[PDB]
Amino acid sequence: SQIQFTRHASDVLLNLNRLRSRDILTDVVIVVSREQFRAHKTVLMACSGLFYSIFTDQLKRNLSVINLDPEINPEGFNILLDFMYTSRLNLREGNIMAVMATAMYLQMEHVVDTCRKFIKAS
Amino acid sequence: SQIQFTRHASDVLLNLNRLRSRDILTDVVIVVSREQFRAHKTVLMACSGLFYSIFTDQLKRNLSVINLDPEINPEGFNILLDFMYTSRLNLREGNIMAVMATAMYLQMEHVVDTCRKFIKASE
């Protein structure tokens, strides 16, 4: 019955990326060691088990700043943040292990799974 | 040559709908005559020229409440809000004219265009 707009989801994602790129209505900064990343909490929650857990927790939901585990690699977070806003995952042999480790911590399981496929077919 | 996750965008949209449904991290109420609709401002901006303009305006970006034109039909808004969060547009002969009017006001042009196609093909 309802009409299906097959490009609508991509268009929303693109526009969300645009707002990120222009720092419009970002409501959190994610600190990964010394690096910092401005993002939208809802997009984070929508792509990550961990962010889902953090922002669902009432004692954290209204934080403006979230410090990740210091073990966490910034380049890895950054690749994944970009993935969250694009559907495009930049996997290279030089980054794969840091990307997967970061995905495992962020609870991005289909990413983690894709990483393992990349590793084994390497 | 990045890896392309073809279901990722829909998955994000679905999850955004889930948060809407549970009233998680909604930051605005859209008042359409007497009725009220909680939403996320970013999703609204992302789907609507008007909401884009409202929330990019510095004098309005931080408003928690937006009153639409009293002319605007609630059932029509609601159908479109649900479209924004689902990719699914519920067009019926009984609603089509109010849906299109609402889409024209919200500046959702591929919707408005689809509405015109629905009208013309209705026999």
Next chain:
Amino acid sequence: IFKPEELRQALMPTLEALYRQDPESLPFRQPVDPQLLGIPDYFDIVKSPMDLSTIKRKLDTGQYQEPWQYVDDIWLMFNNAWLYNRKTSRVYKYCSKLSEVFEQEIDPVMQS
């Protein structure tokens, strides 16, 4: 022989009396959506779903031949909820209260 309109006139107030209960009817007014609600096991536990809206349709389309068939769907609906939801949960508690209300005013109607 029960004609649609007879049952509809007899039974629809009992249905409408459930809807009138707020908030308790709210988990029950629409079919359970496992996807939106984020409970993917639902259709494994609950093999025959039922809700107020599906019952209302069946009345209005005169799909009940006898009142016991209406009463069966009402209990399927309540029983699905009691089965699926934890006893601590709000929707289970709402199920209990809603069931009270149904009993209160089906017993009269069923006598005729």
Next chain:
Amino acid sequence: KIFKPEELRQALMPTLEALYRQDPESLPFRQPVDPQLLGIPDYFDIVKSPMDLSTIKRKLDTGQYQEPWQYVDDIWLMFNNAWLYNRKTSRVYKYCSKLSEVFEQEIDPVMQS
């Protein structure tokens, strides 16, 4: 003449690096123009041969320039794309003007040698 990769790289790269050093002016120039992210879909209709600092840097480091005039052509293509595409009132056009000043100051010396 015999211009070696390392020759050109050593001669020209300071001129490139001198552009990057300019801040904020180099910022619209450091990465290829992204029409989609930036929300300017006509870009690739106006600008049929894109160029930016990063693409030029690659070409140097990959020794894709045989002669310094080829490097200087890409730099001017880059500036010219910006002057073409951006309006004269706009910040990126104004940045283009400033950045081009700096390039001219840097390259005139180097091109004699």
